[PDB]
Design a protein around this ligand. Structure first.
Ligand SMILES: Cc1cc(N2CCCS2(=O)=O)c2oc(-c3ccc(O)c(O)c3)c(O)c(=O)c2c1
Length: 272
């Protein structure tokens, strides 16, 4: 609506375009996403670790979603600190907060479906928030195997897999499974975690796109996956990456993992 004055074009959203804008009325700086019963619900999905949806505006087939604005995203923060790496305390805080945000959405039956560094926003207060939450109901690097294998009614576990991939990237400073096509993505997972079978994943051989012809890769020792992360960390990650969605640790249980024992809330140094 006319009540806004775009300040600059942030980025291309997986649904449309996102602008930094200012409300003439409230005088508040916001994020204007250019694109119903599904978004409305999302307005009541409030939590400190979930980017707030301020308003929804529908007009002439044009849909606008107004969100609180944050200055930087996790992807941009990882590139600018890839030579020095993000300190463990911060990685642990971020992971602990993300799991909090997730534990809340899930407790309410809302999946993100497409978590990735770009949609994780941070501020100078050391807080990180989930962006584009619930909007699903091009990167494939954070997509869970069951999704890739054709499961149509996948669960909250898919978000856990994505966060697990992200957690691994912060530690090593390189994408875990950098797929450039669905088959390449699926095979990259297989080559690290081992081709799944009925032993570790009951039901895998009956899934829509599974094939008795998939190559049989061995599971690589986990200590070569994300070094030099400590045991509490490798233990948590392995559970976030279990093949079977029913076995994959939930957000709630992960917050109880010993890894968060010494969890604090440091602040990164932003250079807005
Ligand atoms: C520096 C930067 C980059 C991005 N973006 C990261 C990738 C999408 S974006 O370019 O908007 C971004 O997205 C969203 C956002 C929230 C919810 C949603 O549904 C969106 O579509 C976008 C914000 O509130 C925000 O403050 C912000 C800031």
């Amino acid at each position: 609506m006319e009540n806004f004055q775009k300040v600059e074009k942030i980025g291309e959203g997986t649904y449309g375009v996102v602008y930094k804008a200012r409300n003439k009325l409230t005088g508040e700086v916001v994020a204007l996403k250019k694109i119903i019963r599904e978004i409305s619900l999302l307005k009541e999905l409030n939590h400190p670790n979930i980017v707030k949806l301020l308003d929804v505006i529908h007009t002439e087939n044009k849909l606008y979603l107004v969100f609180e604005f944050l200055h930087q995203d996790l992807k941009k923060f990882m590139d600018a600190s890839a030579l020095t790496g993000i300190p463990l305390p911060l990685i642990k805080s971020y992971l602990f907060q993300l799991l909090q945000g997730l534990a809340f959405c899930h407790s309410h039956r809302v999946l993100h479906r497409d978590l990735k560094p770009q949609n994780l926003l941070i501020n100078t207060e050391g807080a990180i928030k989930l962006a584009d939450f619930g909007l699903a109901r091009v990167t494939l690097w954070y997509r869970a195997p069951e999704i890739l294998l054709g499961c149509k009614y996948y669960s909250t576990a898919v978000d856990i897999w994505s966060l697990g991939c992200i957690f691994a990237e912060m530690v090593t400073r390189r994408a875990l499974f950098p797929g450039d096509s669905e088959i390449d993505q699926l095979f990259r997972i297989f080559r690290t975690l081992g081709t799944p079978d009925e032993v570790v994943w009951p039901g895998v051989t009956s899934m829509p796109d599974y094939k008795p012809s998939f190559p049989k890769w061995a599971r690589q020792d986990f200590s070569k996956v994300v070094p030099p992360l400590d045991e509490d960390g490798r233990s948590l990650l392995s559970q976030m990456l279990h093949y079977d969605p029913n076995k994959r640790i939930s957000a709630k249980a992960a917050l109880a993992h010993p890894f968060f024992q010494d969890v604090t809330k440091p602040v990164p140094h932003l250079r807005l």
